[PDB]
Amino acid sequence: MFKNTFQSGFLSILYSIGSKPLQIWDKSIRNGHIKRITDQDILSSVLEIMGTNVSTNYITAPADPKETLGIKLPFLVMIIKNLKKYYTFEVQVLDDKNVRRRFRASNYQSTTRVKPFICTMPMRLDEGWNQIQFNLSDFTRRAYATNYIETLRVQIHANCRIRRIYFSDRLYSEEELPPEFKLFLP
Amino acid sequence: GYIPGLKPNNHYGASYGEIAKNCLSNPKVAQNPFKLASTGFNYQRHDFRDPSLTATTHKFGAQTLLKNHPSIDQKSNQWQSQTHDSFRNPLHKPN
Amino acid sequence: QHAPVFEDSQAATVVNKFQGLRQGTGGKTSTQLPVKQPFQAPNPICGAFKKRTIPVSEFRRYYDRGDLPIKVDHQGSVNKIIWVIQPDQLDYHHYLPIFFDGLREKLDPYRFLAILGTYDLLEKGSNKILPVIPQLIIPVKTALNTRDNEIIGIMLKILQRLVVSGDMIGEALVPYYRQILPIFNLYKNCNKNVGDQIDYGQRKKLTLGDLIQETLELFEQTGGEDAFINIKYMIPTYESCVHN
Amino acid sequence: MREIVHIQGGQCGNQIGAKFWEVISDEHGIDPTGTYHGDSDLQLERINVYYNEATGGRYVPRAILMDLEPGTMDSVRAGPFGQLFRPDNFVFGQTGAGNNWAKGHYTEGAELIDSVLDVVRKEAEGCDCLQGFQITHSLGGGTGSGMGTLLISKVREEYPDRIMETFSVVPSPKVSDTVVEPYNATLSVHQLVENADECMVIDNEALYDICFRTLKLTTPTYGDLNHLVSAAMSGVTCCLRFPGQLNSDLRKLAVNLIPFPRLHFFMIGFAPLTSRGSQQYRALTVPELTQQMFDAKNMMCAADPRHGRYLTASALFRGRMSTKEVDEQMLNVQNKNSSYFVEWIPNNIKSSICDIPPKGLKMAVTFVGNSTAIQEMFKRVAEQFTAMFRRKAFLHWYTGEGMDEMEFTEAESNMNDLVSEYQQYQDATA
Amino acid sequence: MREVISIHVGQGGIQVGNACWELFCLEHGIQPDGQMPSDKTIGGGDDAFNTFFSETGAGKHVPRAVFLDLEPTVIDEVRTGTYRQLFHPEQLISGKEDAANNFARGHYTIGKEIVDLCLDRIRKLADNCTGLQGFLVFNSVGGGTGSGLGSLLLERLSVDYGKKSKLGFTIYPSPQVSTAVVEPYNSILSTHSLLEHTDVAVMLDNEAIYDICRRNLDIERPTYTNLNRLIAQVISSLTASLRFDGALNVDITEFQTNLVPYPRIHFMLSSYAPIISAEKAYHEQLSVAEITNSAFEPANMMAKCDPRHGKYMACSMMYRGDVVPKDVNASIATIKTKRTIQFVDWCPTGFKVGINYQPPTVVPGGDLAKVMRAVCMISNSTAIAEVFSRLDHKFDLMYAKRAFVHWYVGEGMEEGEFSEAREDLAALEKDYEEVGIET
């Protein structure tokens, strides 16, 4: 999946404006609900997931288990409406030595510890439309001192609305981004 | 076949060999307090009298219960099981 | 009505051999003869979502004999109401209970004369609404007791217009939360799992599950400090909104 | 430590307890005069929860017999074991509530309840670490329904962290005793639910059915009904006064039976209870105790358990029995009625064990279960009350004592609402 | 110059802790009063009482334990029984109000009034010993007091003493049979605290032992008194090498060095054999080769988890009795041959063998009958992913409508705490699978 494929400037793993918003992704919902709607903040269609039992509901990157989503894109970013409830998103990465690293981010946790397999960290999401640029390069070097070759998996849980997900490959300001990536203000 | 002890009155936890030993070796399971005959002819001598009745009416109507219940011996479970040496040695077997 | 010719009803695959009186389950006491399954009770379902049979509403009694001053104009494309007198002078404490009693009415024109009348009072009305809050609960409570999708939907549109209409009106609903909330418990998570396929209920918000959430949220912001504490006692699933 | 006090009201309350203490007195071995005559060391290890000491060596029941008429409390004294109550504890008026919830809740009870609360304060303060109160009252009696319900309200304002157990007898539809039952009963629940930490419903109709189908005793008497209710009284606190394999206090039972904050109504039962003549034949062996526990007839309430599904249940097994078969029977009774049990609370049976049997038995079980059936009592009570209100029948006494006609409708919304919301969880699934 | 301090918290710990002392008390010739008889001394070697006891100068001895429980009934029983003379009077610290199964109750609100005293008592016993190897902590997860107190005490200990080793012998809820109705709630929270603060913790689910009792002892009427005793023997097995002679011993510090591949995966389940009643204990040879067969029989596992569904990481399986080393060689080889026991790819050999000579003792009045050879196994297997699997699923059902939640939010704990435990348990689920994938 996405191996031996070109990755220079941008990569659109997921999106919302299209005939089939999600084909690579796989869904598994037990108590939640999945749908898309138009948001009153930005005049466009946005995919939304809501529910309770935050851990039970999620949407995975790879179609099924037993394969890989290897990508050499140095940065990870994502646009998400702040719903002011529980929220999470975790990614898994591969280091220079043959080890598996997964970092899980929680909004409702205030204490962080590193671990041989998990490294938690808190967040803060502001009201209104906002974007987060998870470094994914220094963080891996600040926890295990082992360089990062590729990112294996990207996972998003419920209680959030996402317009676009993309990998930077270098720090970009507002001016650089083509029209599509930029989130035009209402 | 019919360990007289187990089913009728519940026995606390113990070994099957030990629990069975306690029942068939204890008293009762015999002796006639009334002397009725096996043939069924001493019937007209005995009266078949149950001494657990007084009377009732105009206040309270339950009457106490028959002698099939314990008393005096009331003591928690911890007491019986846990003790140091006041029990038969597991491997005594005098020879 | 029509009925099939029952007697002619036929069967094809089943054979036409007859066992007759001769049978007997004796002499063959095997270990696998069929055993009749004893009659068993069904699983009780009861009345989760059955109809409620709204009772008689006071609206018609007033309009029938001509006591609520209201007319159904027709100059505009869609019927727009015209007030006989300028609605400033009206004694809101008197008629306002009459209107929300109309929420129940569905048959025309009352149902149309029911909702539209309510909106007008709360728009221009600014300060005289507050004294009428204590008396507004009774008509609304049973309306939420209807358990009808058409009936329940409008009030939720009604409630939102009710609170933010005037200042400080929001908090006064807090001590009355113990009565309005109950119905909201049932429909909280009755949404459609359409998935990737788009949902077009956008133009008409008839999706009951989504409609509720926006209703509860607006309360706590306007409820004040005590907005959150009381809410948790009625519908547990709620999550703090004002708090980070 | 973790002691309790008893405050009982109404003629139904005063008489019911009188057999409650008498039953309790024998178990510990305390004779009517107050001089110890027990037989075991354990008998006195925990005489402090219910009994208090004084120079002279006899013991006192921490109760305050409270009622609005002089006949009941003057009568209870003359009864057997009637000398235990402390003369200072008695509090009573001089008018009589006249079965009027207004009299015992606004006009008459208020004037006298000022003092009765003072005795509540004194008794509560002395204890080492107060645990909670157990209130006895019948919702069908004006002074009992009003004064009893108004007593609790202020109590909840002074001890927010203590448990409050209330035993009420609701008027069943089959047999009624007062023409004004629906009015007073309807009002009470409006306040009892919001204040009581736990309330157990008891139906008179069930008892008379129980006395015949099981007891078969030809001539039941007001003693007979009191005996059965008193027996279940010892079940909730059976293991609290003795040692055992698993302790179980009132708080633990509350912490495991009330799913949501708005549901604190239970129903109870007792076993074994076999006819007097045929007592020598039966075998008291674990399964026989449990099957008698879940049968509809044994249920203390007229509401049929199998007309609804059990949200949860707790059984306080008491006596000498191996824990394993105590637990195994509970599991067997959870699948065989899988549908009858709500399926979003897995493993919904609770067990407890105590090792001190009362006088007259080798094993017994006390049953406290929360079932969806109770919606039948509220609806049936709700239906009758709604009938009398449309015609202003008997309303003119309550309106003449400071109340307004509006106050009742507010009760109507609450009673029905709890009726509907109780059944909301009866149909939800995964 | 070696010692261990025993901590019992909660009724489950206390009652089992009570059991563990009669076995320990007899095993060194100390009667209930604590005084060693001047006649009929059976003592092999000296200092043997030192591993768990401390001398009083002349005569009796004392146990190295601290009992904690807020319910006076359970504790008050011991002080009035036949072992009153044994324990030190002012170490049975207890309160007045019960925890009431509210996990927050014993950890945020009621516990804070006793935790301070408990640590201070721990300070006194720390100085008395010389080189303390570690602590043994017993507690039942299914209770708030055990779960609530256990977390608070462990976290304080992890900061007060530091790198010293601690062991927890818990008792987790069964798959279908469970006494309480709120046990699933406090199970998830407990493992969250105990995963980050303990070295070795074993599984002792009740339901499995019931099957353990029935198959061998042939007793259909078991009670907790018999149940706890069996745990006593395993307690003796794990410490056979710290107070006796041997040919190849094992220290307690040699457990965080052979049985935990990674810091996170440190849950292990045990198994005991043989347990043959006196009525049948003397009709077979009980060879070392055959006994170890019973050790790996799927049914006799200490917990209700079938090992056949996973991998075997490492089994530090111990011996006591008349075992010659040469026989042990034949026993280890035979196990590897069998195709029903399959190991991981990165652990060629996964056995740490131990031997001790002092044979198991017989507690009078019990069920066990005397034997020559006994092997107790502490085995880490990938099958443990199941026990956490069902526990997490149960949590999901009850918290969808968040029933029973409002009895906790009133105890001062924040709402988000409940969800956080899911991250710890759920994340643990993904780790086991990653350990077992063949590379």
Ligand SMILES: Nc1nc2c(ncn2[C@@H]2O[C@H](COP(=O)(O)OP(=O)(O)OP(=O)(O)O)[C@@H](O)[C@H]2O)c(=O)[nH]1
């Ligand atoms: N192995 C074993 N487990 C027990 C015993 N007694 C209780 N348990 C377990 O303990 C759990 C319930 O907790 P309790 O033992 O009653 O006591 P607790 O957990 O400390 O909580 P509290 O009683 O409030 O102090 C049950 O699920 C049982 O599994 C016992 O004698 N032996």
Ligand SMILES: Nc1nc2c(ncn2[C@@H]2O[C@H](COP(=O)(O)OP(=O)(O)O)[C@@H](O)[C@H]2O)c(=O)[nH]1
């Ligand atoms: N258990 C029991 N209940 C009784 C007895 N006598 C009356 N009752 C109940 O008491 C209720 C009437 O109470 P009431 O006298 O009006 O209470 P009061 O108004 O406070 O005096 C009836 O519903 C009866 O069911 C009795 O001897 N035993």
Ligand SMILES: [Mg+2]
């Ligand atoms: Mg306890």
